[PDB]
Design a protein around this ligand. Structure first.
Ligand code: SUX
Length: 134
């Protein structure tokens, strides 16, 4: 067992707050905001040795990232940004920083009760997206 065990599984989006304004701040255009904001993704998290894999599946896009904690990687996001990402575990929270074009956004995934609470922050705008086990 590892602390990260609490994240493993299939998680379904159950609520979202302020995601449209967060996407505006990230620079996402109108049409992608509307279609992406409509999505109800599942977030599938698994661990094999030191490698964590996080899949996002939805009607909009399916994405997958695999990574080792603290080791930067290149990622293409669902909205087609080309970003440099680093994910760490900080006090029980998975902290995902994405850098591109001199910008940065931070995505925090935390277990709270039976939920996975995900806070996304860009330029002082936060969106909170909550997932429950499938
Ligand atoms: C379908 C719809 C939305 C996304 C998405 C997107 C973004 N940020 C998230 C953040 C990350 C973690 C929780 O939300 C998700 C997401 N990934 N999984 N669920 N949502 C960046 C803003 C532009 C839109 C793409 C992915 C697929």
């Amino acid at each position: 067992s590892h602390m990260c065990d609490a994240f493993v599984g299939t998680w379904k989006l159950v609520s979202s707050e302020n995601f449209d304004d967060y996407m505006k701040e990230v620079g996402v255009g109108f049409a992608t905001r509307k279609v992406a904001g409509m999505a109800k993704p599942n977030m599938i998290i698994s661990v094999n040795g030191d490698v964590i894999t996080i899949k996002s599946e939805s009607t909009f896009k399916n994405t997958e990232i695999s990574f080792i904690l603290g080791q930067e990687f290149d990622e293409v996001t669902a909205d087609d940004r080309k970003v440099k990402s680093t994910i760490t575990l900080d006090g029980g929270v998975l902290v995902h920083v994405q850098k591109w074009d001199g910008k940065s956004t931070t995505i925090k995934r935390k277990r709270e009760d039976d939920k996975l609470v995900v806070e996304c922050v860009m330029k002082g705008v936060t969106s909170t997206r909550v997932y429950e086990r499938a």
